[PDB]
Every structure is written in C-alpha cells, then in structure tokens.
C-alpha cells in the first residue's frame, strides 16, 4: 500500500507513516487499543461479570477457596459434568475438563490447590472456535482441533504417530503449516484417560487425542469456517467486542455447530483475548488463507486519508541553505507547522 515504516528505539515498536499521520504498532497492539479495554480483557472474573450483565451467554460456575465444598457446589452448577481449573492463571496445567465422579473432583481439587486461591464450571459440549473481530466487524473464523491420531487400520498408537508424523506439511517451528507430534508423560496421561497407551491398537476409525487443548504449535490443526457462520452469531460476536472495549480481539467460543444460533445449540463464550495471534487465519491447514492485515491497515489509515506529509528536498553545490530558509518561510505563511534542517540547526516553526 506504499506506507513507509520504521523501527523505533524502544520496546520493539514500529512506526507507520510520517509526521502528523504517523501510527504505532507492537505485534497485535496498536495506537488505537485502549488500556481500559485491554486490562478488562485480562481479568476473567471481570470479563464474565460485564458480559452476563449485557445478556451475553457465558459458562455457569463458582468460587471455592480450596475447601472440600465441591460436593455441594455441583448442586448450584448442574451436577457432576464440570470443569475444574486451578484458581489462578499459570499455564494450561492442573485442569480437568470433564469430571464425572466425586473422587475425580477431588483429584482435580488437589491439583487446583497448587495455585493461588473458576472452579466447578458446568461442562459444555462442542468444538473450540476462534473468532477474529477487528474494528467492531468480523474478519475470520477458525475451528481448532488438538493433536491426534486415528484408527487408520489395526496399528498401534506409536505406529500411527510415526505414520502421520511423516506428512510433508509438518515442519519444525513456524516453518511448515503443521508441526510434529511429540509424546511425553503429559501425552501419556491424556491417552490413559481414553483407555489407550503407545502399544495399544486402535479400533477402526477410533480417535485418540494426544493433547487436552488445541494449538497449532503442539501439532493440532485449524480449519477455516469463515463462510459458515450464522448472521445472528455474527451480530453477537461484534457486540461482545464492543462491550469489552477492544479493537482487535479474539473470541473463544464453544459450540457444536457454528452455522446455528448459539441459543439453539446451547453454546457459550468462554474467553475474550486482547491482541490475538494470526497464524491460524493466514496459514490454516484446511480451507483458504485470509488477508487479516488489510482490515487492520484500513482502520489505521482509513480510505481517502494520507500516510505521508509533503517533502521538499533541496540540493546542489551552492545556495542550498539560503533556498531552504526561504522556502520554509513561504510555507509557513499558510499557518502550517513546518520543520526543516540545514547546516546551522534543526527547526520547527
């Protein structure tokens, strides 16, 4: 688009444009992103409170400061199918997604207890969808699926991993679309809960997950679903971004069918993320890539506006300084701010 750019001397910032038309960015944050919005988005309790007060569907749940009250909390939440998270935010660890029994709730309790004193949420069924909204307007939707292998014949999991991890579209770190499947004690813990281990043979078409959550960097996939989203769901997503005051936002939605209204499929909004990444939308594993940047530059530099200021460059062997002072003096009679440089000094008005 012919917009000039520069790196700045502090905090990894980049400048776009010249003089009075300049803008700054830093990764996915910009000069248009407000602080009140970004801080609210980082407060899970605060975000939930604000959205449910606006009539927006969110998960049902409570606060237990590691007291053995889980057996009663389920009466307010909706029975045992619950989600237990560590109360604080310290990576995706110590989380049980689908608790079905009393003793499971306790095992989750004991792990949750590791973090400072989001517990017993009702468990909702569906897929994990990421919705990208840029200027109060929807840009892209992607479905996220965790690393897995399937019953592709009567082979074991270690055999299936070696078979599918040879796929040519799987390359190291941010190098190829997909990445490699790696098994560790945490993959084993996930497989054991499904009734399988590395030497187990899967039944035809059985699906076994090697991770509890979806992430492309851990070997999962991302499917573009941008054109399959229902008009009412589009309206709701845009309203959420406006309520929480963020320009560029990622919204995490759990639903079985993005093509039906969330009220009919019993879906919920789980999280609002300020300054989301773009890999899943510009390099999806299925579907067509989207030009995510174009909507960002359009809000920073709206159609019809300049990104540059006039530049008058004077050279030659003799007379440059005199010519420069006179030309700056003439422009100044129009009432504008004129900056100039010469061999004597740098001036502004």
């Amino acid at each position: 688009r012919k917009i000039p750019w520069m790196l700045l001397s502090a905090r990894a910032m980049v400048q776009l444009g010249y003089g009075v038309y300049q803008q700054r960015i830093q990764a996915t944050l910009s000069s248009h992103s407000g602080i009140l919005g970004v801080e609210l988005a980082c407060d899970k309790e605060g975000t939930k409170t604000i959205l449910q007060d606006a009539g927006i569907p969110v998960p049902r749940g409570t606060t237990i400061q590691y007291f053995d009250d889980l057996e009663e909390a389920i009466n307010d939440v909706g029975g045992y199918p619950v989600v237990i998270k560590p109360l604080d935010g310290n990576h995706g660890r110590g989380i049980t997604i689908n608790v079905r029994h009393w003793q499971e709730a306790i095992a989750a309790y004991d792990l949750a207890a590791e973090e400072s004193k989001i517990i017993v949420e009702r468990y909702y069924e569906g897929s994990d969808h990421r919705v990208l909204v840029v200027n109060g307007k929807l840009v892209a939707v992607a479905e996220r699926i965790p690393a897995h292998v399937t019953g592709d014949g009567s082979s074991t999991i270690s055999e299936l991993i070696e078979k599918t991890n040879q796929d040519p579209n799987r390359g190291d770190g941010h190098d190829n679309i997909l990445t490699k499947i790696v098994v560790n004690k945490t993959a084993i813990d996930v497989m054991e809960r499904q009734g399988y281990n590395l030497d187990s043979v899967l039944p035809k078409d059985e699906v076994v997950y090697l991770r509890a959550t979806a992430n492309l960097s851990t070997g999962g996939i991302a499917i573009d679903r941008t054109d399959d989203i229902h008009p009412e769901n589009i309206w709701l997503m845009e309203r959420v971004a406006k309520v929480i005051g963020l320009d560029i936002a990622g919204i995490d939605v759990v639903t079985s069918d993005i093509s039906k209204p969330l009220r009919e499929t019993n879906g919920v909004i789980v999280e609002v993320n300020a300054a989301p990444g773009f890999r899943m939308h510009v390099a999806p594993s299925q579907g067509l890539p989207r030009n995510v940047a174009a909507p960002v530059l359009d809000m920073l530099f709206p159609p019809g506006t300049p990104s540059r200021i006039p530049i008058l460059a004077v050279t030659g062997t003799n007379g440059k300084t005199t010519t420069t002072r006179l030309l700056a003096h003439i422009y100044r009679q129009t009432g504008k701010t004129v900056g100039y440089t010469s061999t004597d000094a740098i001036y502004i008005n």
Partner: peptide, 4 residues
Amino acid sequence: DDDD
C-alpha cells in the same frame, strides 16, 4: 505476553 503477545499472540494470545
């Protein structure tokens, strides 16, 4: 923190 970036890329949330």
